[PDB]
Write a structure and sequence with these properties.
Elements: E1 3-7, H1 16-26, E2 30-34, E3 40-41, E4 44-45, E5 59-62, H2 66-78, E6 83-86, H3 93-102, E7 105-107, H4 112-115
Parallel strand pairs: 1-2, 1-5, 5-6, 6-7
Antiparallel strand pairs: 3-4
Helix pairs in contact: 2-3
The structure holds coenzyme A.
Length: 116
Amino acid sequence: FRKIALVGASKNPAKYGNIILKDLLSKGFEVLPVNPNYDEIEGLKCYRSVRELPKDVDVIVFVVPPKVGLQVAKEAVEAGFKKLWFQPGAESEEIRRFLEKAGVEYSFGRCIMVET
Ligand SMILES: *SCCNC(=O)CCNC(=O)[C@H](O)C(C)(C)COP(=O)(O)OP(=O)(O)OC[C@H]1O[C@@H](n2cnc3c(N)ncnc32)[C@H](O)[C@@H]1OP(=O)(O)O
């Protein structure tokens, strides 16, 4: 990965949306936070939705509840994104069903900070 969008990025230091953002930046990744609550996180422009993301994002990492994730994954696929990574707790079989049908690459059960 080079350019990573982070759905559920947060300014709350107790939340994985913040911990992951800081970790990935520390590792030299370009990270684009996505969360309607924030206009910036760590000074970085924060996107309202995945529909606004630049088309050269390599992967979208999800750290939101599965009910939210299903909606966002639909938006991401509609916007042309094809690599969707779900942090443990963000996945569901309904998401799996939609993603297998859409024919996009996805990851369940793998920890992004471990894998990077
Ligand atoms: S793998 C080893 C490390 N472990 C993890 O990374 C564990 C990850 N999983 C979890 O923490 C939980 O299982 C999940 C459900 C993934 C996340 O739990 P949260 O309690 O943190 O979930 P929140 O409801 O607080 O959501 C996280 C942030 O996402 C924001 N959010 C809601 N809806 C959207 C949409 N549509 N788009 C972008 N972001 C969205 C929430 O508002 C929240 O951010 P805050 O601003 O902090 O509220």
